[PDB]
Amino acid sequence: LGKFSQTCYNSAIQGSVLTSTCERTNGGYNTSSIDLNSVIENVDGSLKWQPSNFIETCRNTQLAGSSELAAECKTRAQQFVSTKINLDDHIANIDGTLKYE
Amino acid sequence: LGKFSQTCYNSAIQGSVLTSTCERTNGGYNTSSIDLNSVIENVDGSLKWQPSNFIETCRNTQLAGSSELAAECKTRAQQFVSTKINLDDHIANIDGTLKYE
Ligand code: NA
């Protein structure tokens, strides 16, 4: 559904970063931001949205230790198996901000 | 390339969201989060990092109007052309916080 600009203002892009000042559900405001590097993609010169399947096919997410993600996900033979990934692998700290590279 | 957890503490995974409080470059701290649904994916049951080429093949990004990304991207034949996309198609404000949905 999207529609952020409807309830936001003073938006800006910088590199692939988007930042805006957005209304709460109460009456105040907050300034967040999203990296668009992992959400849009370039196909022959045109931008498109990227598909994803983590929220929709995996479950019961958890952090083990300092940088290990753990969950259970759905296979091709449509059964849930246990899987794990080191988030240190590609998640970095870039001046107090968490960044995917 | 990566290894955030050597300057971050108190990390937490909730849903697809990772949250951590990190070491600013000077001496201080900042608490961030990154939505992993667009960073990792599941391939037959196993979680894999997702590749993407936007900032790697595109340049000169601009917010045009209220909600439109504009940029120039390289076509398979290595030529920069024009390309826009409406961010409001999937960027949302969830309680003062921008989300991709
Ligand atoms: Na992605």
For tokens 């409807």, the residue is A6
CA distance A61 to B48: 15
As a whole number of angstroms, the distance between CA A18 and CA B18 comes to: 19
Q: Decide if A53 and B71 are in contact by the 8 Å CB cutoff.
A: no
Bridge pairing between strands A91-93 and A80-86: unpaired
Cβ-Cβ contacts under 8 Å, A67 against chain B:
3-5, 11
Q: What is the dihedral of CA B32, B94, B92, B40, to 10 degrees?
A: 50
Tell me how far apart the alpha carbons of residues A56 and A33 are, in angstroms, rounded to a whole number: 23
**Taking CA atoms, what residue in B is nearest to A61?**
B15
Could you tell me the two tokens for B95?
A: 């309680």
The experimental technique used to determine this model is X-ray
Helix segments in A1-101, DSSP class H: 54-57
3-state secondary structure of B89: helix
Q: Which residue ranges make up each domain of chain B? A: 1-101
In angstroms, what is the span from residue B38 Cα to ligand 1's centroid? 4
| Residue whose structure tokens are 């198996």 | A81
Given resolution (angstroms) = 2.0
The structure tokens listed for A15 are 């590199």
User: What CATH code is assigned to B1-101?
Assistant: 2.30.60.10
Is residue B46 exposed (0-12), middle (13-18) or buried (19+ Cβ within 10 Å)?
middle
Give the span between the Cα atoms of A71 and A63, in whole angstroms: 9
Tokens of B35: 């939505």
